[PDB]
């Protein structure tokens, strides 16, 4: 592809071309709102006489499934304040930067954290600084601490005696979680080390069967030759838990205040879907769903919540 092509010769630093030391950095916290960690640079990179200063957005991750939002105003958002702005890496958040020694070089995030969702469109518009903002939703588990950076530099812009600043976002991920209460339909290891059950194509015995409780999370790694899936769009119960509505089959229509991620499977790197159980859901429920194949050869999946 071209949206993830990395320049192996690229190099840069935190201070960039400002000669500033890490101590003089203006480190601040992200405005987090309902599992959404935010780094807004609109009112932070405005030129100042005392510039070019360096503002650092700290992002500390010790929890799962944080929707990350990063802002880097566009050239001309204000008439003259961002006339010479630069955001790096260009093809973000597909491409990111990691600290090799003291300098930085390009790295692919999907190749660094498996199971991360990067919807190519935010508010109907592309997911790139060209449209002014970038988003991405984290995975539910991480094995090793991962640190990468973003860049949003307005220092090259000047408003008479004032000068813009160099914006940077540091993401210090801490090891959280262990595995997924889900199934794995089958470089390649991170597929196997993330689920409790593995489902092989040629000869499978047990179908998918993911067990859940109140406040736990599960997921699925859908196959490579998938035709369709109904495991969060159309759920069906069996035996006798509750009288069934033939239309309230979407996971959102089944449990109030439930969550689904990548319901449309539009993510670029992986064909995956996730869910979350609110801490207020104390009702027991057991459901079923199916999956399709290109061949119709279908697999099945089971769901159990608070089954105790």
Tell me how far apart the alpha carbons of residues 77 and 145 are, in angstroms, rounded to a whole number. 36
Backbone angles phi, psi at 227, to 5 degrees: -100, -50
C-alpha 113/C-alpha 136 separation (Å) is: 12
Q: Are 48 and 42 in contact (CB under 8 A)?
A: no
Least Cα distance to 210 among 113, 141, 282, 300 occurs for 300
Q: Quick one: which of 283, 182, 290 has its CA closest to 241?
A: 283
Least Cα distance to 89 among 174, 26, 20, 148 occurs for 148
Task: Extract the tokens encoding 150.
Answer: 């973003």
Structure-token pair, residue 76 = 């001309």
DSSP string, 33-51: -SSEEEE--TTTSS-BTT-
Q: Position of tokens 């970038």?
A: 134
258 touches 278 (CB < 8 A): yes
Resolution of this entry, Å: 3.3
Which residues have C-beta within 8 Å of that of residue 245, sequence separation ≥ 6?
A: none
From CA 155, how far away is CA 54, in angstroms rounded? 9
Kindly report the backbone phi and psi dihedral angles of residue 13, in degrees, each rounded to the nearest multiple of 5, phi listed first: -135, 170
Give the integer Cα–Cα distance in Å for 30 and 191: 32
Fold for 180-305, please state it.
Answer: Immunoglobulin-like (2.60.40)
Helix (H) or strand (E) run with residue 192 in it: helix 189-192
């Amino acid at each position: 592809d071209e949206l993830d092509k990395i320049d192996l010769s690229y190099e840069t630093t935190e201070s960039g071309d400002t000669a500033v030391s890490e101590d003089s950095y203006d480190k601040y916290a992200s405005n987090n709102t309902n599992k959404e960690y935010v780094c807004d640079f609109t009112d932070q990179l405005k030129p100042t006489e005392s510039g070019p200063k360096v503002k650092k957005c700290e992002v500390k991750v010790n929890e799962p499934l944080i929707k990350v939002k990063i802002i880097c105003p566009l050239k001309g958002s204000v008439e003259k304040l961002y006339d010479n702005i630069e955001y790096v890496p260009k093809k973000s958040p597909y491409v990111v930067l990691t600290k090799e020694e003291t300098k930085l070089k390009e790295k692919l995030l999907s190749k660094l954290i498996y199971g991360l969702l990067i919807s190519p469109t935010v508010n109907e518009k592309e997911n790139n600084f060209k449209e002014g903002v970038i988003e991405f939703t984290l995975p539910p588990v991480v094995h090793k601490a991962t640190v990468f950076y973003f860049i949003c530099d307005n220092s090259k812009t000047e408003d008479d005696n004032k000068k813009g600043n160099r914006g940077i976002v540091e993401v210090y991920v801490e090891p959280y979680g262990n595995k997924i209460n889900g199934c794995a339909f089958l470089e390649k290891i991170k597929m196997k080390t993330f689920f409790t059950q593995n489902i092989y194509k040629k000869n499978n015995i047990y179908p998918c069967y993911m067990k859940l409780y109140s406040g736990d999370i599960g997921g699925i790694l859908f196959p490579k030759n998938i035709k369709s899936t109904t495991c969060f769009e159309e759920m069906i119960p069996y035996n006798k838990e509750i009288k069934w509505n033939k239309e309230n089959k979407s996971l959102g229509n089944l449990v109030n205040n439930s969550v689904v991620y990548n319901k449309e499977m539009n993510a670029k790197y992986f064909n995956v879907q996730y869910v979350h159980i609110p801490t207020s859901y104390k009702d027991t429920l057991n459901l079923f769903c199916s999956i399709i194949l290109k061949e119709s050869t279908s697999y099945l999946v089971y769901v159990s919540i608070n089954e105790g």
